[PDB]
Amino acid sequence: RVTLQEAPGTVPPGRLPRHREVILLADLVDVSKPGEEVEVTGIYKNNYDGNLNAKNTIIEANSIKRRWTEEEEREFRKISRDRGIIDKIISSMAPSIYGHRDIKTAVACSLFGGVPKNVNGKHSIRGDINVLLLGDPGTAKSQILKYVEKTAHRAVFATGQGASAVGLTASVRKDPITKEWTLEGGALVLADKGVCLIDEFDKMNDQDRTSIHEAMEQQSISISKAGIVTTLQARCSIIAAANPYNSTLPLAQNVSLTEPILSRFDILCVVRDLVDEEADERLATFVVDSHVRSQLNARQRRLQRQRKKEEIPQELLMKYIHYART
Amino acid sequence: NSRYLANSKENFMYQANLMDRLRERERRSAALLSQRQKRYQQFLAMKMTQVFDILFSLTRGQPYTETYLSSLIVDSLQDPIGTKEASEILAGLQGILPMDISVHQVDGGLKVYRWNSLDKNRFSKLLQIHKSKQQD
Amino acid sequence: DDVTGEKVREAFEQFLEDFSVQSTDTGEVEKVYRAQIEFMKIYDLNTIYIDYQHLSMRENGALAMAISEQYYRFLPFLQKGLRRVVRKYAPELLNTTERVFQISFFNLPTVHRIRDIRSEKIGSLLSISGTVTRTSEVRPELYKASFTCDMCRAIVDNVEQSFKYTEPTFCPNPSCENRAFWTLNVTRSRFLDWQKVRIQENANEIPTGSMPRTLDVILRGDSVERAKPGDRCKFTGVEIVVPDVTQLDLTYKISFLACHVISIGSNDNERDQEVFLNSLSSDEINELKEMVKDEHIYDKLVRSIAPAVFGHEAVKKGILLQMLGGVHKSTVEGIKLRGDINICVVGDPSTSKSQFLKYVVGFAPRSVYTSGKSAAGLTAAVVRDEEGGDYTIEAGALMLADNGICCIDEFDKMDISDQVAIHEAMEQQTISIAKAGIHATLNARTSILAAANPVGGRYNRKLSLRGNLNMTAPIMSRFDLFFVILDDCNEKIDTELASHIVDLHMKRDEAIEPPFSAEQLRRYIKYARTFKPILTKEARSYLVEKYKELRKDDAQGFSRSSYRITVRQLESMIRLSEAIARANCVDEITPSFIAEAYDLLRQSIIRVDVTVTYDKYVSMMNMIVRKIAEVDREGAEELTAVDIVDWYLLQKENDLGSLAEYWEERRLAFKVIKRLVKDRILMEIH
Amino acid sequence: VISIMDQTIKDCMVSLIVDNNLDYDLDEIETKFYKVRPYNVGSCKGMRELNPNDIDKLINLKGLVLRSTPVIPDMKVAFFKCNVCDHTMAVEIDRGVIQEPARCERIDCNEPNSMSLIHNRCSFADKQVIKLQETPDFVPDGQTPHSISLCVYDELVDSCRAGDRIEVTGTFRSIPIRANSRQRVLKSLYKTYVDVVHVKKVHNEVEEVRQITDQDLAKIREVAAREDLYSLLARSIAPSIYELEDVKKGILLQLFGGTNKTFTKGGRYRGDINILLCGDPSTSKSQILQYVHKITPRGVYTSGKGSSAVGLTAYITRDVDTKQLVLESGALVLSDGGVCCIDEFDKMSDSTRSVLHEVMEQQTISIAKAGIITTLNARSSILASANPIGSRYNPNLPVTENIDLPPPLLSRFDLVYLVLDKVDEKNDRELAKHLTNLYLEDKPEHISQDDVLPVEFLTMYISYAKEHIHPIITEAAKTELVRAYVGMRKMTTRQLES
């Protein structure tokens, strides 16, 4: 019995994901692993339970297949052939935020990531670029995290207040039906080969900061509780956004963090809210222009206004990242 | 061209002839004040017509106090009518059907309403008479 | 055979074929019930919508009274008569086995509550309105099953299930004696999607010390996935009694089998104004037209809000703009802009702070009153259900009061962990929950109305706003306004304040004479929220110019401000200007509204200290400066003292001075122009 | 007896129609079953005096409501329907016995074991269970107050909330319990329950009350006519403590207190008097808090460190019968109408001092924990006694520096007395002679009977004036209050309401 949940990139914002039960028979077992994207092509059946009528949908699989067309593959080579392909991607990252060109280069590099390779079967060098968003709040810091959840293929948004010790890593919980010690995944477990989004990194407990540092080096979370010794994997780009910003004080005193925590992050973005009359006029005009525009002729006019404000569309940028990652 | 209260004319910034216009403002105490009292009658005459089709389309006979009936009208029309406006609805309906709604005052400031048979055909014919009397 | 049941079914068939509402735009006799059946054939629907007001207008309401009194007894009769009308018109809607059609009644008169649920109303059509807290999944239900025996091999079709797996006791074949062996046929059984929704009381109904009651509402038909947690919906159904299957003295449980869900928070951007204008009475539109035509509507709505508190007109101005809010615009990438305005009440204790918070809760819909003295009670909590066993999500204070104003008291006495979840919902208006394997995002588009206290009792003017309050830096930057109420010991302020308390305690409700009643204010607030003002080209240059002048006062180093001007101060002026234009029913942001919001924002930023009404002196001074300055631009002659009083004689036509009060305003104009002569504002040549 | 009263009231109703000769429907009145609700009897036996011989006897109970349970449906008329000919029947339940029909009543059917019981078409009755707690005024010292189960029927449900003083005067019935849920055996013990008949609070409304005696009202007006009322009541409230005339004059007004002018469109104003005692300890400070609790029927006595922010509000307890999350009242909720005595007010935590800010202003306790955001009402006066840090009020130190109380907490009080322990030879000599006279004779023979009022007469003078006497501020009295408020500031709004 495998419990399949909806993908994080298809769930609409403001709703809760659903999950059903999948039954694997014959040689279909030991195929789907906890942390992969498969295509269950089974029959939608139903079962009657005695407890389902007094307290107040099983899919029998038949074939499992783990996870663009030919016209979209030829268009990627034509766009990337230009000399300004790098500048076009940076300008397309987060089109709802004006300015802040230094922060868009770190988010775009963290989405693609590096090439991990083992060293003669001994060490495993990571490739996920860790970006730590630091600076004064008000510069659309939290708006960048919401953009990755709607563009990346696997992004799990989390926080620092609600997510405790088991909110990020795995846990050993008891099943209320089978009365057995099951294993429930967390934020770092359900985001394998994806992007990790954590909000408010400074307002975190001491028990949760040590579990993150242990997964940023070996890319594995070893949890041995209730006699269940399991060593799960966790390979993702942790993109946090904490809050202190005194310019006279260094980063070790402004941010409430330690030394090994700041050393694991690759790029350290620092935002300084300065006073400039030229930057305030350009920022105020983009806000009003983005709020005015907020049956076939009416739909075509709305799509043309959105493509003019981004200038590369958003639908083409999503498939361009996953094409150069596998 | 329907009712649309949205125009740019509002807040447009920039002898003894106008003094005579201020003398005519004293006549508003019997004209503008009388029109304000008639405006509340328009929001009570047509408002009590649908109220009789709401309470009588439910329970009947059992006694109902003024405090219990006022909280049921506001809760059923909040999607409004205040607590003070709900008391005038039951008071105006007594003059239309005095033989169907019985009002018995209690020594202490309490009114209990009671109805036996509420006919919709009899109230529909009496609603057009009360609406035409206020228009004259 | 039921004699009374057959009479209701015969009258229900004629109601769906003879009733017709005349259209007011075309004037043609169009049948709404006949056209609804034809619309269900294209979209392949199995749920009809019948209004209760149309049933009472036929046969003097004789048919609507028999259904509203005994709904469970006439339930199979109403479904049988509906299938006969569909078969006569479009018979293709029966073949899928016959489809199960359900009737969903909407627009009901009386709307009962949860505390009014009694045993005498079991089996009658009611209407319960509450807030949705917990919801189950989409699971099928065994309605009309088919049992096939193993001996006689007879297919017993049309087997109803009364909330229990009932089996037939006898086989239709007389040559068989089987009373136990029965096999369920899934290919010949009718399944229906049922869902149990646990509702609770409304967020606006906050009585005294009571216990929150819950009701298990069962939805059937097309009502699945229609009651989202956190939104107050209007349910409609019958009160059923579900027994205990695990105990099979028989314990029973009170349930509510609903058939239609009406969302109150939900109800083309131009169609939002025609619905609210048509749902009210004819006299309600006439009362709203005279208010917009009034040139002094911004001054009357301020005095009408909180009449028990005297003075403090600056703090009362932000309450009107907070109830309306801004325009929630969406970007082209999917980001949602915050349109709400958060105001914090900072000042000395015992300054009518509890009166302002209790007035917003007991007036604005969907408002939860809480205090600072937990972390789960504000946002949400993950509590496992004791019946089902799975982990559920429990709504808190920021979820039940959606699209409203959340009043929080004692913000400085909050913990560090409890303040981290508050700042998270003050940016994207969303709450991220990641616990017990549940990774879902819940919206929180509320308005936080804090009321903290300064550290030390009295507000120290020698310190800043950050050092005087026990709050962090990112949380203090979320509020757009900071009304500082200073407890000044004045002889004129304490005299007028003590007179209002004595008059309020003696006359009770007789001393309160507001310009607008409570029912008239609720209709203007909900109507002004549908308006969306658009910034014009002339108003765009005034907002940028006003932002540069305010930022120059903080960079000069002379006036030590209590808070550094950041980027949020620029976006706060846009949200405040939209709320002012909404109160005047204007779809265009005039440049005059920016100057009004700029004065309120400057009064909230108090710098760190290192006979004639004051409201009338500023109005008479602002009008006398622009009039004289216009002479130099136009190129006239001069302006004597006689023409000064004559200038206000034509502009103040709505003063209502008559004859006695008119001469008093003329003498006051001579005293106003006399103070400007002694001061360094105006001058006289001869 | 009640069954006889239900029939005699029916024949008297028909006699009133014939004597009046009215044109009303006589069938609609005779079919209505009238019920009699007797209350306020003479047998006011408590829960501890429930003798076994009082089976099925109407005994009046004077307790307090603890919790509230939802309405439980009770079947009254069963509904049966055949499975072959579909013959609907209606069989009433007699003495809790559902006599199911063995055969069908139809002649064409007549099949044994063919009737189906439909619970969805039965006439259910309202039944509510209310847990009543014993009154602490009748519980002896050294014993814990027990509880009892109540059964409310008819239309009297949803009329008793948690923290309300009612008077249950119903029969004392009993139902047997089963030893097993699957067997038909019964235990030797019988579960006792009181069937509620009438609810008199201490639906419908009380028309009048007949408390105390009219002969005692003549003695009440006799003392009111005397000019020495402010001095006679000040000495009788504490005859064991010498001096402290200015302190006892404030506590006397706290028991009475101003009226509660409730407003419909205005906010609720707190009319209680919050008195805070300060100064050096060992000055008869703890003895005052022990005397007001014995006079007030709903007064409590708590300590500083002994009660945190959970014991004073409402601790989330659990029932030992249903194992459900219940809500029990605290020290500030059980005292709905009395004076709360708190010892060691300066030794409280920071989480407890923040909760009292809302009780001394709006008299409401809003708790939002575990997803339960409810507002509890707590309208009562707070009578505490503060203490300095080093247990010695230094004359060369300010009041805000000697006591660790928050400045906002000091402004919320009404009377901040400072009882100091000054060394005086003329004061210590007279104080020692007064305390020695109380130990020599058990009764004050030197003091006349017209100088010290008993405890029974003092409680009847406060409860009578707080239910009928309502002073109204006139124009002459309101003018002096404004002038006195301006002069005090020339030397907050909380001092004006005090």
PDB file of C-alpha atoms in Angstrom, chain C residues 65 105 139 159 167 181 191 206 249 266 359 381 391 455 481 509 557 576 581-582 657 677 683:
ATOM      1  CA  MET C  65     -45.798  24.920   4.282  1.00  0.00           C
ATOM      2  CA  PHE C 105     -33.334  24.567  -1.990  1.00  0.00           C
ATOM      3  CA  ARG C 139     -15.775   9.329  -0.163  1.00  0.00           C
ATOM      4  CA  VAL C 159     -32.233  -1.595  -1.726  1.00  0.00           C
ATOM      5  CA  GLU C 167     -29.384  -6.864   3.753  1.00  0.00           C
ATOM      6  CA  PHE C 181     -26.202 -15.508   2.174  1.00  0.00           C
ATOM      7  CA  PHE C 191     -23.174   5.282  -5.352  1.00  0.00           C
ATOM      8  CA  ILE C 206     -18.886  36.370  20.799  1.00  0.00           C
ATOM      9  CA  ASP C 249     -29.985   1.368  25.234  1.00  0.00           C
ATOM     10  CA  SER C 266     -17.890  34.767  -1.808  1.00  0.00           C
ATOM     11  CA  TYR C 359     -16.616  48.818  18.939  1.00  0.00           C
ATOM     12  CA  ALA C 381      -3.194  24.484  15.251  1.00  0.00           C
ATOM     13  CA  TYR C 391      -4.379  14.858  12.001  1.00  0.00           C
ATOM     14  CA  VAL C 455       7.437  50.208  28.762  1.00  0.00           C
ATOM     15  CA  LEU C 481      -0.176  54.316  11.172  1.00  0.00           C
ATOM     16  CA  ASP C 509     -29.095  55.995  24.735  1.00  0.00           C
ATOM     17  CA  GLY C 557      19.311  65.244  11.012  1.00  0.00           C
ATOM     18  CA  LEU C 576      -4.594  55.152   2.444  1.00  0.00           C
ATOM     19  CA  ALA C 581     -11.676  57.764  -2.464  1.00  0.00           C
ATOM     20  CA  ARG C 582     -13.766  54.691  -1.622  1.00  0.00           C
ATOM     21  CA  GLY C 657     -26.997  79.681   9.553  1.00  0.00           C
ATOM     22  CA  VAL C 677      -2.758  90.164  11.043  1.00  0.00           C
ATOM     23  CA  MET C 683      -0.814  91.570   6.243  1.00  0.00           C
TER      24      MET C 683
END
